[PDB]
């Protein structure tokens, strides 16, 4: 409500909350059937077609007080299967245990495990594709008294094998 | 089995293997006769591989699924698409299975819900599902089912 349309709609704040297994972020990899991935450049191009194939890669640039450390778990759950709600659950699917203290930028390439040869860009049905999910593997550890709530940024893009077809559009007044 | 068009066509054979492509044209609109408003919504569509827990309450753990694939579809863009390859437990899907243990094959289950929270103006949405079997191969050819299903 308040953070949409303002510049805070990009700052993902790792809070000073407990080890609640409820993910710290779950993104539905269903391009048009999920409002978030439709405002990205990659999403904009996908509003000019009907089909899309290939992989999409996710990057996570951590912006936390150098000294600060911790381990997060970026996980992906293939199409159809319900979004992982508990750590352990997600921990069993495709996941990278990204180390805050070691490398700042985390990349996770989501593959092309699709039924047909071309998936939709319409909300006819909610054909739940992937699920980019980030969980608290450990927790954040901060030196001395440095702000206990720092932020992260997420970047999405296409891969060289990404393609589109059937030029359609929607422009209004 | 629910739709006729695709059914008869698939019945012309006894066995098949087919990489299955699904498309999700999602459309919405407001219910109540009111000048109520809403922000663009994001729907989560979940494909659940055959032989898993089927979600009930929109709530429950089975909606997080560390394994089940999902697709977050933001409204107002090109419809969503995922390809689930031959997910048969046998060497072919049995269109007409003879014998005993109807659960024909089980191609999975789809669950769709709104991700956004409770908006004052209630919004309905219909999720159309399309299925293009690709790389299809078939076996023994039966006579076509003539009648009504």
């Amino acid at each position, epitope marked *: *409500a308040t953070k949409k349309n303002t510049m805070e709609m990009y700052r*993902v*704040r790792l*809070s000073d909350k407990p080890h*609640t297994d*409820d*993910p*710290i*972020l*779950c993104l*539905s990899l269903s391009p048009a059937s*999920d*409002p978030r991935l439709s405002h990205t450049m990659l999403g904009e191009i996908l509003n000019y077609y009907t089909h899309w194939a290939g992989s999409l890669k996710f990057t996570f640039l951590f912006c936390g007080s150098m000294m600060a450390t911790g381990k997060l778990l970026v996980s992906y759950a293939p199409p159809g299967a319900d*979004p992982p*709600k508990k750590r352990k659950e997600a921990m069993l699917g495709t996941h990278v245990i990204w180390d805050i203290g070691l490398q700042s930028s985390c990349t996770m390439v989501v593959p092309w495990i699709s039924n047909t040869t071309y998936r939709q860009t319409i*909300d006819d049905s*909610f054909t739940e594709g992937g*699920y980019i999910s980030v969980f608290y593997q450990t927790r954040i550890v901060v030196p001395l008294s440095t702000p206990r709530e720092m932020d992260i940024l997420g970047f999405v893009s296409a891969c060289n094998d990404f393609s589109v077809r059937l030029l359609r559009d929607t422009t209004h007044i | 089995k629910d739709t006729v068009q695709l059914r008869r066509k698939l019945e012309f054979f006894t066995y098949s293997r087919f990489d299955m492509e699904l498309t999700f044209v*999602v*459309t*919405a*609109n407001f219910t*109540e006769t009111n000048n*109520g*408003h*809403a922000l663009n*919504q*994001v*729907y*989560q569509i*979940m494909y659940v591989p055959p032989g898993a827990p089927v*979600p009930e*309450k*929109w*709530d*429950d*753990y*089975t*909606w*997080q699924t560390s394994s089940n694939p*999902s697709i*977050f579809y*933001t*409204y*107002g863009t090109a419809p969503a698409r995922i390809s689930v390859p031959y997910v048969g437990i046998s060497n072919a899907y049995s269109h007409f299975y003879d014998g005993f243990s109807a659960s024909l094959n089980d191609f999975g289950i789809l*669950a*769709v*819900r*709104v*991700v*956004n*929270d*409770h*908006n*004052p*103006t*209630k*919004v*309905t949405s219909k*999720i159309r599902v399309y299925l293009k079997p690709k790389h299809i191969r078939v076996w023994c050819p039966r006579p076509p089912r003539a009648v009504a299903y």
Partner: nanobody
Amino acid sequence: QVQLQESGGGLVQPGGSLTLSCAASGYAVSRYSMGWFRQAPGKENEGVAAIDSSGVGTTYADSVKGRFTISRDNAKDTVYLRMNSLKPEDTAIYYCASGFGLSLSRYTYAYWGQGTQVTVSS
């Protein structure tokens, strides 16, 4: 476009048991989990209650728990939060959102409500 209309928000007085309700447009309730977040006056947003009507998996906030009851309809596609025993801190502006989810977390949500304030002041 998915619509969630936040209704049932009005002034209660320390110990109130009011109820909120939100409809589901564009999608079937079970496709999205459903939740609530409150913007405490001059504070950041806090998760309150969230469940997915698919199989109904209840989850509440630490403060909120026990008192408030999150329930879901699949016929009218509505979420009913029975805000029982409302207290002075619970004087915040609520918002109904659909997640994935299946619970309380700033992000992990898609469509958001317009706005409604339940003032818990005698």
